[PDB]
Design an enzyme around this catalytic site. Sequence first.
Site, mmCIF file in Angstrom:
data_model
loop_
_atom_site.group_PDB
_atom_site.id
_atom_site.type_symbol
_atom_site.label_atom_id
_atom_site.label_comp_id
_atom_site.label_asym_id
_atom_site.label_seq_id
_atom_site.Cartn_x
_atom_site.Cartn_y
_atom_site.Cartn_z
ATOM 1 N N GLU A 41 0.847 -1.209 0.000
ATOM 2 C CA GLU A 41 0.000 0.000 0.000
ATOM 3 C C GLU A 41 0.885 1.264 0.000
ATOM 4 O O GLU A 41 0.673 2.125 -0.854
ATOM 5 C CB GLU A 41 -0.940 -0.057 1.206
ATOM 6 C CG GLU A 41 -2.031 -1.117 1.109
ATOM 7 C CD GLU A 41 -2.989 -1.021 -0.067
ATOM 8 O OE1 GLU A 41 -2.846 -0.085 -0.859
ATOM 9 O OE2 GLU A 41 -3.843 -1.943 -0.232
ATOM 10 N N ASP A 59 -12.375 7.626 -9.201
ATOM 11 C CA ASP A 59 -13.738 7.988 -8.748
ATOM 12 C C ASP A 59 -13.664 9.321 -7.997
ATOM 13 O O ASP A 59 -14.727 9.817 -7.620
ATOM 14 C CB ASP A 59 -14.378 6.877 -7.918
ATOM 15 C CG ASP A 59 -13.784 6.670 -6.532
ATOM 16 O OD1 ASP A 59 -12.694 7.227 -6.249
ATOM 17 O OD2 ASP A 59 -14.433 5.982 -5.731
ATOM 18 N N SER A 109 -12.103 9.727 -5.062
ATOM 19 C CA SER A 109 -11.770 9.430 -3.653
ATOM 20 C C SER A 109 -10.235 9.421 -3.608
ATOM 21 O O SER A 109 -9.592 9.358 -4.696
ATOM 22 C CB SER A 109 -12.361 8.126 -3.137
ATOM 23 O OG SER A 109 -11.877 7.004 -3.867
ATOM 24 N N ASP A 139 -6.779 7.718 -1.258
ATOM 25 C CA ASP A 139 -6.268 6.726 -0.266
ATOM 26 C C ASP A 139 -5.150 7.414 0.538
ATOM 27 O O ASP A 139 -4.299 8.094 -0.063
ATOM 28 C CB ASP A 139 -5.698 5.490 -0.955
ATOM 29 C CG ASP A 139 -6.680 4.731 -1.818
ATOM 30 O OD1 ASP A 139 -7.900 4.825 -1.568
ATOM 31 O OD2 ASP A 139 -6.203 4.043 -2.729
#
Length: 129
Positions: free
Chosen positions: A35, A48, A50, A52
Site C-alpha cells: 500500500e 472515482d 476518492s 487513499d
Amino acid sequence: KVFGRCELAAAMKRHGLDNYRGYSLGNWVCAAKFESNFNTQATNRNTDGSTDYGILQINSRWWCNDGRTPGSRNLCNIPCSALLSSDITASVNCAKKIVSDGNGMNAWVAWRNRCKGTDVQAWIRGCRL
Ligand code: NA
C-alpha cells in the site's frame, strides 16, 4: 514518516493489530509494504475522485473525511489527514473497523493480490517482537 519493517511490526503489535480478526502481524506488514512502502504520508487519487491515505491507504469514500469526495461517508470519524501522522494510532483504529466490515483484509486489493496466501511471516522475520 517512513517506518522500518520491524519498527512498523512493533507499532502495529503495540496497537493490537497482531492477529486482529485472525490476521497475523505478517499480513498487516505485507499490506502496508505494498500500500505505502511504509510511508505514513503516502496518498493515491482514485479515478472515482476518492483518495487513499497513509500506511494502509484507507480511502475517503467510506472511512475518513477529506471534504472533496462527494456522497462519501466518514465511518472512522476522522479527517483523512489523521491517517498521514507519524503516529499510526488513527490508521490502526480505522483498519480495525475496515477489516471487521465483512471481507476481512480483501478490502485492501493489494493485500489480496500480493500478500494473500503468501509466506507473510517473512515480513516479521528477524524482528524483536
Ligand atoms: Na469521506
